[PDB]
RNA sequence: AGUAGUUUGAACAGGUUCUGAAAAGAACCUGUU
């Protein structure tokens, strides 16, 4: 039969030039290209898209229909709009485009838009003969229109047969020029049955073409979508002309990107023994998998395991029934637990962990070496490195700490307490230490898991946030013995490091920030590195190792063994889901931070201290672009700057891991991104070369997920208090580990959340009201013993308002060094609130009708929860 | 009530086109649900309004059904595979970020219903059926393409074109009160119904008022035999079993209409004839007893099938293009609804953040679909309320022939002057109050 | 106008409970990097 598309084509073929020119743009969407075209004529090579295809691809990318990632292959790249647009996406590490070129065809145009250094466009290539390659994203935009539908059908079938071998469980966006002929439809249905995806019409396409796009992230009925497009195009013939919807063109930015995908080369003289032992252990099911996804890691083998991790959340009934106005707030109701199943772990690995960062230039490496040496000498001015003993480890280790056993001889203890109590555990530790003394490692392997925390998501799940690495308990003891003095001697406390905040406590951090705000200088900057532990190069690993020059020979041998055999040569076990089940892959990597090591916090703080010192250097003019490119950079200038003012510059910073607050002497620090981006510390949520934003009020500076407000009490005393968006707190309090609904067996957890709100976030009106309501709706004689169990102390009320006020007075008055006066507060009415405007800006719902109704009729909800729990003893917390 | 097996297999969409009173709600639906329970199929049932859901619940006694509608009670255990809800509830859950079950069978009563969410749900259901992942039964007596305003009934009906009054009447109109049996009067608004029922109670006739505001109490009272008049809006024009004797249908209503005419806006176009489907459904509420042949239908004009410029086609496309599921389905319209120019011509898919703002504006702000889409497609966040004051001076909201002026939540006095005009935000006093609350930041 | 509803790492901080004459030990919970 005659399809609607064929009728549309017949109609289109018989339009005069005037009516065709009106029809082709009737009601379509269209980008404004005048300024971009004028710039492209004048040779401008930044900020401009080279064609209209960048907007077309952006339409699919912003609707999540295609998610370019990894290696991107652009078949028929033309001038390169799609490739140059994909260059700026953060998940893309390499773009390769193949266009035929020659007379009658577009040739690639060179540009310096954002990420241009990872783009390679090759002309003179006919993709119909180019052999398929492995790609993570494939973009095909090949096909030219002819007035004859049969010619277009043949061309479309040829393209569809060409692109098929390239597709293997990856992202794609493929132009189907003529999707309405029946044979093209049957081919497309078979292709979708094999590979997935969906046919989608782009509103930016003109009416003079029937082209559709086969995308990877979609489902639906192909015949129905083709029919819908045919009816749309046929209806466009007769309705009244409409001016096309102008929308502004995509800005592609400028500057290079600091990405690299070179493969890993294993040592096999350091890590060969561990891999041999692992292979010998699981010899029954040891195999080598060719479908492994590891690009920048070395892959050694796999073996079948039973999957661990979960992706479920439990609803906290008491908190949810007493926070009804937040049932409609997406930031509250979309909170879930992160996905720590092998699928989620593999996605986190593919995004963050399985990346590489380029080497710094020689000048950057020299500056880093000098700064690290000076910083290590400064940190150990009053302290000497020392060995930590088995007594301290036994005294410190948690009873339920993970054994993390990898080999069979390590798997005969149920708890860490039993292991450190046993005498065979220390014999295993002694043999591995004797191996370490000879410069060899045989049993230090990293188990990898996902962090289980609360995060915004959708459909009941959240994206995995990070990877946690940890060795066996004996290996953890060995690294504690070698490097645990950094934590036990408080090397990164504020007193010793001048910029660390180790051992301070969240509620006391704002005072520190206030103390930083009184130092003369520019604004206050707070930048977070995107995936900090994955940006750790081998250069700053050696710079962290440099601490071993202050140790004694035996301690130096042990610390060198830990640094070189386990921190700079890491063998990891990571789970992966396969069609046959779940496998454990043995992979290897040399440069990264294994978050979960004993020196994670301290070495993170050290590396960030030196990175921010170098950024202050660059902002003050001591470092220039030519100094950073110099293989023979002079050390005298850097050493002079350090010995003259390094401690004063350290006093301007507050460092906690990759969180930093810096108040430099001027605002050139905002634009000093050369060294910072060259060291690999690429900031998050911002283009790599955009200047950073500085705060002029210290009360808005984010630090450790909080900002800090200065409250004034009735008696005139000041108080710096932590605060965050209220939706985060309410959403986090409403979910827990587990699955399903839960009312009676999570009431004490809700009461604990209420106590935490009363202590840290007493200044938020909604939070204090909700905490009092939750406390009034929880039986007063229950005392929790776990997250779900409780005991009944019938003789004692657990935490009354008087007990909470006593705790508040202890925390904020008695134990607060920053309040000289020490008069205790007698009533909750003297405990202050944020200003109403400040409360509203930080996410409060005060001033809303639903909040007013909830506050007025709160006793009804409290009684409802009371009746739901049962007939228990209850106490009223609500102020009179 | 024999059921063909072919309606229970995937890729099959069954249209059931029986005339009103044939037994679709009370005979065929219980049998289909029983057979779906027997075959262990995850089943969804979709009622247009709450009176239809009440009729289903009455006709589904003794079956395990997990009702998800406010009208009915709730005693679900957890072993139910059948859910019951409304068209709008299903569509707004499809637009929400909470996952909905993969139903193996979907039954939709009154599949002609032209609420934008009903059309979006029909499109989604037909798309899922076309993928071979579900089977559907669409139950409707007046399907698309209906031109018969007088369909077949159980018993003959006397159709008379008298002149129905609009407001209360001091005298005359003896034909109204002289009737002996029960009468169902359809009114276009709750206020007109209030006036009419006051006039009717003035004449010693006790009257029940049905509306969405009084349904919860008044519907069960209607299920008695005491009453003599039911003055109602179109909440009960579909599927309502009243056991009445006369229907009074003025066949007039207000419809949202999108006007381009320079700046695009939405107006509540003045009193127009209802569509043929609406008139036929209203007439079908009487003449359902094969034992009563004296049933009367009194109307005051002719219906119109000119249903082309109405805003619900555009709004249905806006809802359908923004359905968010874990599998990323791109749905298409139900096939008989593809012949509408305004539905087929829309490309309304929004990018992620804009889509989230769109859903937030519809669900929290209670804005109409058109206005919510217009605001979201500009990249305006939910809490940003500047667009309510940035409009041209012609878009000034008047009340009592005076400019509406509000106190924002940030302590400022501003004139209500929205950038986009939707007549449904300031038509009734309650709508104006809700929109003032939204513009003030109190919603 | 009308209609429908939100469905088992490392470092640290604080709190709680029990033991203890106090120190101190034991267990749990929340949070930060
Ligand atoms: N057989 C073939 N092999 C390789 N390239 C081809 C080809 N047939 C056509 N092409 C190229 O494919 C291009 C299609 S247009 C690509 C537009 C691009 N997305 C942009 O935004 O600039 C044409 O320039 C043509 O040169
Ligand atoms: N729960 C956590 C959080 C952070 N960290 C460390 O702190 C680093 C930075 O923390 P972060 O919260 O800013 O996350 P990223 O910047 O790494 O994405 C991480 O890379 C980890 O090394 C950790 O060890 N455990
Ligand atoms: N309690 C009731 C309700 C309806 N009925 C009758 O049953 C017939 C079919 O009812 P129905 O609700 O299934 O009608 P349709 O949904 O098919 O239009 C009608 O003639 C009703 O009048 C009845 O006899 N007793
Ligand atoms: Mn970071
Ligand atoms: Mn951080
Ligand atoms: Mn019915
Ligand atoms: Zn070792
Ligand atoms: Zn705040």
How buried is residue A384: exposed, middle or buried, by Cβ count under 10 Å (0-12/13-18/19+)? exposed
Collapse the DSSP code of A634 into the 3-class scheme (helix H, G, I; strand E, B; otherwise coil) and give the result.
coil
C-alpha closest to that of B331 among B312, B346, B342:
B346
Q: Are strands A245-247 and A29-31 parallel, antiparallel or unpaired?
A: parallel
Alpha-carbon gap, residue B351 to B369, rounded angstroms? 16
Q: Is the distance from the beta carbon of residue B154 to the nearest atom of ligand 3 less than 6 Å?
A: yes
Alpha-carbon gap, residue B316 to B345, rounded angstroms? 12
Collapse the DSSP code of B229 into the 3-class scheme (helix H, G, I; strand E, B; otherwise coil) and give the result.
strand
Residue A373 neighbours by CB under 8 Å, 6+ apart: A546
Cα A678 to ligand 5 centre (Å): 19
Residues 385-424 of chain B with CB under 7 A from strand C are: 424
**Nearest nt (C1') from B70 Cα:** C5
C-alpha closest to that of A326 among A833, A850, A858:
A850
Collapse the DSSP code of B155 into the 3-class scheme (helix H, G, I; strand E, B; otherwise coil) and give the result.
coil
**Nearest nt (C1') from A807 Cα:** C15
Alpha-carbon gap, residue B329 to B321, rounded angstroms? 10
Distance from CA of A217 to the nearest CA of B (A): 6
Does residue A114 reach within 7 angstroms of strand C, measured from its CB? no
Does residue A584 reach within 7 angstroms of strand C, measured from its CB? no
What single string gives the DSSP state of each residue in B123-147? Answer: HHHHHHHHTTS-EEEEE-SS-TT--
Instruction: Decide: B313 and B118 in contact? Cβ < 8 Å.
Output: no
Resolved by: cryo-EM
C-alpha closest to that of B431 among B383, B370, B367:
B367
- B345: nearest CA partner in chain A: A232
**Cβ neighbour number for residue B159 with a 10 Å cutoff:** 13
Q: What is the 3-state secondary structure (H, E, C) of A483-494?
A: HCHHHHCCCCCH
A82 in a labelled binding site: yes
Instruction: Decide: B188 and B233 in contact? Cβ < 8 Å.
Output: yes
**Nearest nt (C1') from B234 Cα:** C2
Residues forming a β-bridge with B107 = B45, B137
Alpha-carbon gap, residue A448 to A185, rounded angstroms? 46
Closest partner CB to B127 (pick from A200, A224, A328): A224
Range(s) of the domain holding residue A222: 4-247
State the resolution, in angstroms. Answer: 2.8
**Cβ neighbour number for residue A391 with a 10 Å cutoff:** 8
B336 secondary structure, DSSP code: G
Alpha-carbon gap, residue B136 to B155, rounded angstroms? 30
Does residue A315 reach within 7 angstroms of strand C, measured from its CB? no
Collapse the DSSP code of A139 into the 3-class scheme (helix H, G, I; strand E, B; otherwise coil) and give the result.
strand
What single string gives the DSSP state of each residue in A279-326? Answer: HHHT-SS-B--TT---SSSEEEEEEE--------EEEEHHHHHT-GGG
Alpha-carbon gap, residue A660 to A658, rounded angstroms? 6
Six-digit token string for A732 = 């986090």
Q: Are strands B183-186 and B229-232 parallel, antiparallel or unpaired?
A: parallel
**Cβ neighbour number for residue A788 with a 10 Å cutoff:** 16
Q: Which ligand is nearest to the CA of A482?
A: 7
Collapse the DSSP code of A694 into the 3-class scheme (helix H, G, I; strand E, B; otherwise coil) and give the result.
strand
Torsion, Cα of B183, B188, B189, B191 (10° steps)? -70
- What angle is formed at CA A63 by the lines to CA A62 and CA A65, rounded to 5 degrees? 110
Name all residues whose Cβ lies below 6 A of ligand 2: A 451, 528-529, 531-533, 593, 595, 600, 604, 657-658
CB contact under 8 A, A228 and B333: yes
CA distances B16 to A30, B19, B28, Å, are 44, 9, 10
CATH number (domain holding residue A220): 3.40.50.150
Instruction: Decide: B148 and B286 in contact? Cβ < 8 Å.
Output: no
A459: left (phi over 0), alpha (psi -120 to 50) or beta: left
Residue A276 neighbours by CB under 8 Å, 6+ apart: none
- What angle is formed at CA A71 by the lines to CA A69 and CA A74, rounded to 5 degrees? 100
C-alpha closest to that of B374 among B420, B343, B418:
B420
A498: left (phi over 0), alpha (psi -120 to 50) or beta: left
B78 contact A CB<8A? no
Instruction: Decide: B207 and B193 in contact? Cβ < 8 Å.
Output: no
B191 contact A CB<8A? no
Distance from CA of A65 to the nearest CA of B (A): 8
B112: left (phi over 0), alpha (psi -120 to 50) or beta: alpha
Name all residues whose Cβ lies below 6 A of ligand 1: A 50-51, 53-54, 76, 78-82, 98-100, 105-106, 126-128, 141-142
B442 contact A CB<8A? yes
Helices (H) and strands (E) in chain A, counts: 33, 27
Distance from CA of A653 to the nearest CA of B (A): 35
Question: Residue whose CA is closest, atom 10 of ligand 1?
Answer: A76
What single string gives the DSSP state of each residue in A326-390? Answer: GGG-HHHHTEEEB--SHHHHHHHIIIIIS-B-PPPPHHHHHHHHHHHHHHHHHHTSS-------H
Q: Which ligand is nearest to the CA of A566?
A: 7
A700-726 core/surface letters (b: 16 or more CB in 10 A; e: else)? ebebbebbbbebebeeebebbbbbbeb
C-alpha closest to that of B346 among B388, B318, B365, B309:
B318
Q: Are strands A653-656 and A659-662 parallel, antiparallel or unpaired?
A: antiparallel
Cα B26 to ligand 3 centre (Å): 6
Alpha-carbon gap, residue B107 to A64, rounded angstroms? 31
Instruction: Decide: B190 and B233 in contact? Cβ < 8 Å.
Output: yes
Collapse the DSSP code of B164 into the 3-class scheme (helix H, G, I; strand E, B; otherwise coil) and give the result.
coil
Instruction: Decide: A729 and A757 in contact? Cβ < 8 Å.
Output: yes
Distance from CA of B353 to the nearest CA of A (A): 9
B341 contact A CB<8A? yes
Alpha-carbon gap, residue A356 to A682, rounded angstroms? 13
Closest partner CB to A847 (pick from B326, B329, B441): B441
Instruction: Decide: A66 and A216 in contact? Cβ < 8 Å.
Output: yes
Instruction: Decide: A662 and A612 in contact? Cβ < 8 Å.
Output: yes
How many Cα neighbours within 13 Å face the side chain of A246?
A: 5
A528 in a labelled binding site: yes
Instruction: Decide: A298 and A588 in contact? Cβ < 8 Å.
Output: yes
Closest partner CB to A328 (pick from B331, B363, B441): B363
Would you give the end-to-end CA distance of chain B in angstroms? 50
CA distances B335 to A199, A735, B343, Å, are 18, 43, 11
Closest partner CB to B326 (pick from A225, A231, A459): A459
Instruction: Decide: A489 and A666 in contact? Cβ < 8 Å.
Output: no
A399 secondary structure, DSSP code: T
Residue B214 neighbours by CB under 8 Å, 6+ apart: none
Alpha-carbon gap, residue A153 to A172, rounded angstroms? 21
Is the Cα dihedral B83, B87, B89, B91 positive or negative?
positive
Collapse the DSSP code of B428 into the 3-class scheme (helix H, G, I; strand E, B; otherwise coil) and give the result.
coil
CB contact under 8 A, B330 and A27: no
């Amino acid at each position: 039969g005659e399809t609607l598309g064929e009728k549309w084509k017949k109609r289109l073929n018989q339009l005069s030039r005037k009516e065709f020119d009106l029809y082709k743009k009737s009601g379509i969407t269209e980008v404004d290209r005048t300024e971009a075209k004028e710039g492209l004529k004048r040779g401008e090579i930044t900020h401009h898209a080279v064609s209209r295809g960048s907007a077309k691809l952006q339409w699919f990318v912003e609707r999540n229909m295609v998610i370019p990632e990894g290696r991107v292959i652009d078949l028929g790249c033309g001038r390169g709009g799609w490739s140059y647009y994909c260059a700026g996406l953060k998940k893309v590490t390499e773009v390769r485009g193949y266009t035929k070129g020659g007379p009658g065809h577009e040739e690639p145009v060179p540009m310096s838009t954002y990420g241009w250094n990872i783009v390679k466009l090759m002309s003179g290539k006919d993709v119909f003969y180019l052999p398929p390659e492995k790609c993570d994203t494939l973009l095909c935009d090949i096909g030219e229109s002819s007035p004859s539908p049969t010619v277009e059908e043949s061309r479309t079938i040829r393209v569809l047969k060409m692109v098929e071998p390239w597709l293997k469980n990856n992202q794609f966006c493929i132009k189907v020029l003529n999707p309405y002929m029946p044979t093209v439809i049957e081919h497309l249905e078979r292709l979708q049955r094999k590979h997935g995806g969906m046919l989608v019409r782009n509103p930016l396409s003109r009416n003079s073409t029937h082209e559709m796009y086969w995308i990877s992230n979609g489902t639906g009925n192909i015949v129905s979508s083709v029919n819908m497009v045919s009816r749309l195009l046929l209806n466009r013939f007769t309705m009244t002309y409409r001016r096309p919807t102008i929308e502004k063109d995509v800005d592609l930015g400028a500057g290079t990107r600091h990405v690299n995908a070179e493969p890993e080369t294993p040592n096999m003289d350091v890590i060969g023994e561990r891999i041999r032992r692992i292979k010998e252990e699981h010899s029954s099911t040891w195999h080598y998998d060719d479908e492994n996804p590891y690009k920048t890691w070395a892959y050694h083998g796999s073996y079948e395991v039973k999957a661990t991790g979960s992706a479920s959340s439990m609803i906290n009934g008491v908190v949810k029934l007493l926070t009804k106005p937040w049932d409609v707030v997406p930031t509250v109701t979309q909170m879930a637990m992160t996905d720590t199943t092998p699928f989620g772990q593999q996605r986190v690995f593919k995004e963050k962990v399985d990346t590489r960062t380029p080497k710094p230039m020689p000048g950057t490496r020299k500056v880093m070496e000098i700064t690290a040496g000076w910083l290590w000498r400064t940190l150990g001015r009053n302290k000497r490195p020392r060995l930590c003993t088995r007594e301290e480890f036994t005294k410190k280790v948690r009873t339920n700490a993970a054994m993390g056993a990898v080999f069979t001889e390590e798997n005969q203890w149920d708890s860490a307490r039993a292991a450190v109590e046993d005498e065979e555990f220390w014999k295993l530790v002694d043999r591995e230490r004797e191996l370490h003394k000879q410069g060899k490692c045989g049993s230090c392997v990293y188990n990898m898991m996902g962090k289980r925390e609360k995060k915004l998501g959708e459909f009941g799940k959240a994206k995995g946030s990070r990877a946690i690495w940890y060795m066996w308990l004996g290996a953890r003891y060995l690294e504690f013995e070698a490097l645990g003095f950094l934590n036990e001697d408080h090397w990164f406390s504020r007193e010793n490091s001048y910029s660390g905040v180790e051992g301070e406590g969240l509620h006391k951090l704002g005072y520190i920030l206030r103390d930083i705000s009184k130092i003369p200088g520019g604004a206050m900057y707070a930048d977070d590195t995107a995936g900090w532990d994955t940006r750790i190069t081998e250069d700053d690993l050696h710079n962290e190792e440099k601490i071993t020059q202050q140790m004694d020979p035996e301690h130096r041998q042990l610390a060198n063994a830990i640094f070189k055999l386990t921190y700079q040569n890491k063998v990891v076990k990571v789970q992966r889901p396969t069609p046959k089940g779940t496998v454990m892959d043995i992979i290897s990597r040399k440069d990264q931070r294994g978050s979960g090591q004993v020196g994670t916090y301290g070495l993170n703080t050290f590396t960030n201290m030196e990175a921010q010192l170098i950024r202050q250097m660059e902002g003050e003019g001591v470092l220039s672009k030519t100094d950073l490119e110099n293989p023979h950079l002079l050390e005298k200038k850097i050493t002079q700057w350090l010995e003259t003012k390094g401690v004063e510059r350290l006093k301007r910073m507050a460092i906690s891991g990759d969180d930093c607050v810096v108040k430099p002497i001027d605002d050139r620090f905002a634009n000093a991104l050369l060294a910072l981006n060259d060291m690999g510390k690429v900031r998050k949520d911002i283009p790599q070369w955009q200047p950073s934003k500085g705060w002029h009020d210290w009360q808005q500076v984010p630090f450790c997920s909080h900002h800090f407000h200065e409250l004034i009490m009735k008696d005139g005393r000041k108080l710096v208090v932590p605060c965050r968006p209220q939706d985060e707190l309410i959403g986090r309090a409403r979910i827990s580990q587990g699955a399903g609904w839960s009312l009676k067996e999570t009431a004490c957890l809700g009461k604990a959340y209420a106590q935490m709100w009363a202590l840290m976030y007493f200044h938020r009106r909604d939070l204090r009201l909700a905490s009092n309501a939750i406390c009034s709706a929880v039986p007063v004689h229950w005392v929790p013993t776990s997250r779900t169990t409780w005991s009944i102390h019938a003789h004692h009320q657990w935490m009354t308002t008087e007990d909470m006020l006593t705790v508040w007075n202890r925390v904020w008055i008695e134990d607060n060094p920053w309040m000289e006066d020490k008069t205790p507060v007698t009533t909750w009415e003297d405990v202050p609130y944020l200003g109403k405007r400040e409360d509203q800006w930080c996410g409060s719902l005060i001033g809303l009708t639903s909040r007013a109704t909830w506050a007025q009729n709160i006793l009804t909800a409290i009684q409802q929860v009371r009746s739901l729990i049962g007939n228990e003893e209850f106490l009223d917390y609500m102020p009179s | 009530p024999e059921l063909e097996e072919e309606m229970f297999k995937k890729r099959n969409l069954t249209i059931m086109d029986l005339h009103p009173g044939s037994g679709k709600t009370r005979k065929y639906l219980p049998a289909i649900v029983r057979e779906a329970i027997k075959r262990r199929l995850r089943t969804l049932i979709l009622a247009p309004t709450r009176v239809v859901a009440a009729e289903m619940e009455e006709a589904l006694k003794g079956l395990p059904i997990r009702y998800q509608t406010t009208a009915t009670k709730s005693e679900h255990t957890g072993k139910e595979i059948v859910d019951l809800m409304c068209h709008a509830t299903f569509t707004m859950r499809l637009l929400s970020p909470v996952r909905v079950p993969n139903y193996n069978l979907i039954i939709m009563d009154e599949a002609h219903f032209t609420d934008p969410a009903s059309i979006a749900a029909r499109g989604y259901i037909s798309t899922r059926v076309g993928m071979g992942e579900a089977a559907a039964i669409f139950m409707t007596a007046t399907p698309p393409g209906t031109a018969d305003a007088f369909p077949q009934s159980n018993a003959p009906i006397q159709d008379e074109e008298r002149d129905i009054p609009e407001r209360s009447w001091n005298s005359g109109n003896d034909w109204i009160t002289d009737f002996a049996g029960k009468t169902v009067w359809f009114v276009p608004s709750i206020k007109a119904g209030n006036d009419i029922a006051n006039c009717l109670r003035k004449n010693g006739k006790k009257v029940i008022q049905l509306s969405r505001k009084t349904f919860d109490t008044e519907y069960q009272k209607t299920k008695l035999n005491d009453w003599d008049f039911v003055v109602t809006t179109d909440i009960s024009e579909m599927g309502a079993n009243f056991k009445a004797d006369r229907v009074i249908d003025p066949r007039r209503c207000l419809k949202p209409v999108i006007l381009t005419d320079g700046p695009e806006r939405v107006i509540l176009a003045g009193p127009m004839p209802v569509t043929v489907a609406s008139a036929a459904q209203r007439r079908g509420r009487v003449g359902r007893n094969p034992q009563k042949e004296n049933d009367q239908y009194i109307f005051t004009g002719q219906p119109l099938n000119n249903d082309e410029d109405h805003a619900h086609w555009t709004e249905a496309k806006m809802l359908l293009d923004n359905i968010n599921t874990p599998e990323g389905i791109i749905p298409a319209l139900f096939e008989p609804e593809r012949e509408k120019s305004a539905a087929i011509d829309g490309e309304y898919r929004l990018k992620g953040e804009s889509r989230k703002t769109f859903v937030e504006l519809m669900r929290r702000g209670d804005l109409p679909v058109w206005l919510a889409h217009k605001v979201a497609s500009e990249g305006i966040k939910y809490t940003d309320r500047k667009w309510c004051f940035d409009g041209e001076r012609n878009n000034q909201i008047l009340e009592e022939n005076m400019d509406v002026e509000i106190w924002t939540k940030e302590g400022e006095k501003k004139k209500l002057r929205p950038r986009w005009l939707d007549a449904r935000t300031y038509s009734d006093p309650l709508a104006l109050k809700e929109f003032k609350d939204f513009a003030a930041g109190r919603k």
